[PDB]
Amino acid sequence: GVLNEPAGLYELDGQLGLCLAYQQFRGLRRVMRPGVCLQLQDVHLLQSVGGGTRRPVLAPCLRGAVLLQSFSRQKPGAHSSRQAYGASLYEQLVWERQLGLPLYLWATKALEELACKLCPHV
């Protein structure tokens, strides 16, 4: 799961929505692609919560960090240029106004739709 291609919010099982919240994971932001298999422990599952979705939300309170043990032989494409370039704002967005995470996902959605409406033709 490649939720926010620019801000590279990433999850497993296709259905474990997950976002590297506080880790300054610069290295893990231009690397990933489908085909990688990794390990993890003790990360919250948010369900019976709703408000945006009821799917198995993954919430990483940074106890079990990322466990890199695999790659994925996959070369890049040619389109991400117009649909990924510039997410750096995200990096402080949480630190911006101490963002709650369901709020965070909702705001990401808002930014998606915004970009659809305005960026970058204006």
Partner 1 sequence: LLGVLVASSHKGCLQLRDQSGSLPCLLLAKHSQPLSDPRLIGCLVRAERFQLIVERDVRSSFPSWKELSMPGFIQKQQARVYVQFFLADALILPVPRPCLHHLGQ
DSSP letters along 23-83, please? ---SGGGSS--TT---B--S-EEE-S--SS--S-EEE--TTS--B----------S-HHHH
Task: Count CB-CB contacts under 10 A for residue 9.
Answer: 20
Q: Which of 26, 73, 75, 121 binds partner 1 (CB under 8 A)?
A: 121
Question: Binding to partner 1 by residue 78, rule CB under 8 A?
Answer: no
Question: Binding to partner 1 by residue 37, rule CB under 8 A?
Answer: no
The answer to whether 10 and 2 have CB atoms below 8 angstroms apart is yes
Question: Binding to partner 1 by residue 83, rule CB under 8 A?
Answer: no
Question: Binding to partner 1 by residue 34, rule CB under 8 A?
Answer: no
C-alpha distance across the termini of the chain, in Å:
30
Q: Which of 27, 76, 77, 118 binds partner 1 (CB under 8 A)?
A: 118
Q: Which stretch binds partner 1 (CB under 8 A): 1-9, 32-40, 46-54, 114-122?
A: 114-122
Question: Binding to partner 1 by residue 82, rule CB under 8 A?
Answer: no
Binding site for partner 1 (CB under 8 A): 116-118, 120-122
